[PDB]
Ligand binder design. Structure first.
Ligand SMILES: C=CC[C@@H]1/C=C(\C)C[C@H](C)C[C@H](OC)[C@H]2O[C@@](O)(C(=O)C(=O)N3CCCC[C@H]3C(=O)O[C@H](/C(C)=C/[C@@H]3CC[C@@H](O)[C@H](OC)C3)[C@H](C)[C@@H](O)CC1=O)[C@H](C)C[C@@H]2OC
Length: 237
């Protein structure tokens, strides 16, 4: 196996069994759909999703799964089947996970990646604002309502560029600068230095009105490539 731990301490080793298709790999925030089987190092099978109904689903890089999985899934293409070997530091450590996993145990997983999709950022979870992070930001803070943000943006409608600007503005005042409401909501979910692509359904963009001077008709879906360059948070109550 190839060492894929960022510290290169052989914590996570990976063998590709079947090559996947295309070019894209899931990023932090993405929802991932897999089948897996898990073994102890001596060969004891402790679990499999194939014994259950549907695929196993989780949100990547949000700490829902053991560290080995966050690290390994981020390297897989759709259709790929791989085997990963995970040291205890990258799985369950001293604690173990009784009754299945004993203390200080090395694990082997067979994982097949079926699909992944961007993170739904809407309060209603209706798919109207979808984010695909390209490169994660450098800080943990995020802009709030009333924050002054510095952003670089490119807006596309049917893959044609209609807006390209670097802007300094107050969150909550974007409408006056011809920014759609869904975009301002997305920026409040970004970290300093983050590079991402945001997809907006019409209800979260310019809706039934459109935006005539950008040549955007009623009921248009939009795509923005965004950099959050810096921000100062506003005071809250
Ligand atoms: C809400 C109810 C419980 C909830 C249960 C489910 C949704 C069903 C889900 C299929 C669990 C499985 O049940 C059939 C079963 O999966 C295992 O058998 C397993 O193959 C395994 O290793 N997996 C599952 C596949 C991804 C990697 C890994 C995992 O990281 O799993 C995660 C895990 C345990 C993280 C711990 C959390 C505590 C930290 O302390 C520790 O950090 C050190 C890391 C799972 C997905 C959790 O996020 C969610 C849950 O726990 C575990 C051996 C024990 C686990 O049973 C509990």
């Amino acid at each position: 196996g190839v060492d894929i731990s960022p510290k290169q301490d052989e914590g996570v080793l990976k063998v590709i069994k079947r090559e996947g298709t295309g070019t894209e790999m899931p990023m932090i925030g993405d929802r991932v759909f897999v089948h897996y089987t898990g073994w102890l190092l001596d060969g004891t099978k402790f679990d499999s999703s194939l014994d259950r109904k549907d695929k196993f689903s989780f949100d990547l890089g949000k700490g829902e799964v053991i560290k080995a999985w966050d690290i390994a899934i981020a390297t897989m293409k759709v259709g790929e089947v791989c085997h990963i070997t995970c040291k205890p530091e990258y799985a369950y450590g001293s604690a173990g996970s009784p009754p299945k996993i004993p203390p200080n145990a090395t694990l082997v997983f067979e994982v097949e990646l079926f699909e992944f999709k961007g993170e739904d950022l809407t309060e209603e979870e209706d798919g109207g604002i979808i984010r695909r992070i390209q490169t994660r930001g450098e800080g943990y803070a995020k802009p709030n309502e009333g924050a002054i943000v510095e952003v670089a943006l490119e807006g596309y409608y049917k893959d044609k560029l209609f807006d390209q600007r670097e802007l300094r503005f107050e969150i909550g005042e974007g409408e006056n600068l011809d920014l759609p409401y869904g975009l301002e909501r997305a920026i409040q979910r970004m970290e300093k230095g983050e590079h991402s692509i945001v997809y907006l359904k019409p209800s979260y963009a310019f809706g039934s009105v459109g935006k005539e001077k950008f040549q955007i008709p009623p009921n248009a879906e939009l795509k923005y490539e965004l950099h959050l360059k810096s921000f100062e948070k506003a005071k809250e109550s």
